[PDB]
Amino acid sequence: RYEKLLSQRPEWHAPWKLSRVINGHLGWVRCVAIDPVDNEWFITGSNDTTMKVWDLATGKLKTTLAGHVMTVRDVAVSDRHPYLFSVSEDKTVKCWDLEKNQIIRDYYGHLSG
């Protein structure tokens, strides 16, 4: 097994460097989701109970999405829908109409966060 690893060379990849630091939250950034279609913005749920939407190219802040009362743990953006799904430690799963930026279609049943 060990002579077959030395027989093989890994693919070269280009290294990574920091290009932009964005300071906008009041707590920890706990989750990041990208726009799956057309790639203009990303959204960061956080520890200050609010999700912010950041433009990918310029780095400016587009909007803030409040509506959770505890820390937003994960954020998922849909490719087939204009829907944003967001869970938190406050036992809530929420949907968001991105054509309206309002909470629709709330989900219920998790015993904990």
Place this chain on the structure above:
RNA sequence: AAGCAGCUUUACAGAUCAAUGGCGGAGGGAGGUCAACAUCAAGAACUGUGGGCCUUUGCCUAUAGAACUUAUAACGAACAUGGUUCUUGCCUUUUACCAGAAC
């Protein structure tokens, strides 16, 4: 529109009393605080049918039919409630509330 002729029918006397041609006829009418199924808010908006293009979709062209609803816009010349979210009001907590919005 009286009257005459032409036309369409009509009670019919017919010609034919055949092959015909026209209209009607080859399982009703009125209803029911009966039922089922469709359908009832959108480029001012529908569908069937023929033709051509591309390769079925879509477009263009020709044609037929469009009930109900709608312009001081809506089936209802009528008018309640609930959910979420935002902003207020009441001010021990909650429910029940206050009264505007958006969905």
